[PDB]
Amino acid sequence: MRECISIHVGQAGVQIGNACWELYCLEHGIQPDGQMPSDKTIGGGDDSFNTFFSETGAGKHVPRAVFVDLEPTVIDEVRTGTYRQLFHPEQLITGKEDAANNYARGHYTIGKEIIDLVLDRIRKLADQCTGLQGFLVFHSFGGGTGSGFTSLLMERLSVDYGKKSKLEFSIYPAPQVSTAVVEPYNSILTTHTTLEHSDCAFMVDNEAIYDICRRNLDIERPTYTNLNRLISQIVSSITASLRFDGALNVDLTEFQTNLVPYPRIHFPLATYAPVISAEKAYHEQLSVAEITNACFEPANQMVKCDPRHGKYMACCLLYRGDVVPKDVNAAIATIKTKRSIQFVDWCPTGFKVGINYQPPTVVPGGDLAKVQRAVCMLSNTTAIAEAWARLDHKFDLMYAKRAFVHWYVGEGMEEGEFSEAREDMAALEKDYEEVGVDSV
């Protein structure tokens, strides 16, 4: 047992969910019809992959997942796509009017009309779990649905499932692929509302992913599909410990103990390597030392910021593939001498290491080269607050003139909700400053 239920919310969350579940099926040998020939446990089993897939008597392996959107367009492509047989129709939930890039419509006007149905569907998934561990919630900061409906759902989940674990994968906005000018408003509103209801949240900066596709995959102008194939690789690295068995496997919840020193400081920086084109991986094998080194190169981070000018409170390495502890320990030792890794004075400096032997998979027709070993680093660095600073500044430029605020007020929100949300963000930025100051 220890099941995990994934919840995919709004355009970004749904489409990233498509990439992730496709990759999971390839990693576990699950066909588009849901059949898994190597599973001799027909209709059940307590295997590692069963944390993410349930099984029917007919041998079908079904994602423990719900897709929710306030309009039908994006989820309809799942209903008619390559993996349509994978999902029971009740797992794919759509309204008719989206949030129109408006947090207040996602949280209140449109969102409140479908929230009870969404919790009914989630409840049906939970009732099939013998040991439910928690939820993984995928959404954008910037969309009206990803921000407003997600925070409504997180509030309702805290009520309906006590303090059962809730983790987030959150898409931080970038000008290169953003869709709305009010994304800073929606980001601050949802970050404020969700902060108490989330235990751990992985921010993915679309500009960082966009740059990695351009720099390392030689993609001239990356699309959502390019970004999502890379994002799903990072999500897969983080969830690999939950989905695979392993002597050196370390549970994600055990990394969380180290990553979260105070409830509000729960935003780990993810760095992933190697991201390399097929043309360049050819006759070029990257060693454990090389991919580990790449985790301390800021250009490989999921969030643009500079950990060299911040302090570390934790550092975790999640390896997959042909890796043994001896190579890892050797790579870390040289890195410590050669790199700018400053820890805060109140936490130990060792690196926590997990190794899963199943090597990374790539989606056919993708851009990533298939490699023998990969690593995702998860670090708690004060540097991640820069991303809050950039967003809070953009929020402030517009809010001082109250630009666009009438669209939220017209849906029933009050100005005090904006300032209350911005004050929490200011206090968050200050929390990150304080944890970095030396003890007395």
Binding site: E155, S158, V159
Partner: protein
């Protein structure tokens, strides 16, 4: 020590319950005032549109008086 052990678990139950309780009350209050505020905004919008019908009736009346 046994007394302290059950007081610890009762305290854990009480905090978890109180958190659930306050979250439930917080959004119930939030959705209530959101519904009021949106309705007040729509009510004001109609009330000014209706004043436009009152004024349009008066306009036709004044035209009749001009005959």
């Amino acid at each position: 020590k046994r007394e302290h052990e059950r007081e610890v678990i009762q305290k854990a139950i009480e905090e978890n319950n109180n958190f659930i309780k306050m979250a439930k009350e917080k959004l119930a209050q939030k959705m209530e005032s959101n519904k009021e505020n949106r309705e007040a905004h729509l009510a004001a919008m109609l009330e000014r549109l209706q004043e436009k019908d009152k004024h349009a009736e008066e306009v036709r009346k004044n035209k009749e008086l001009k005959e």
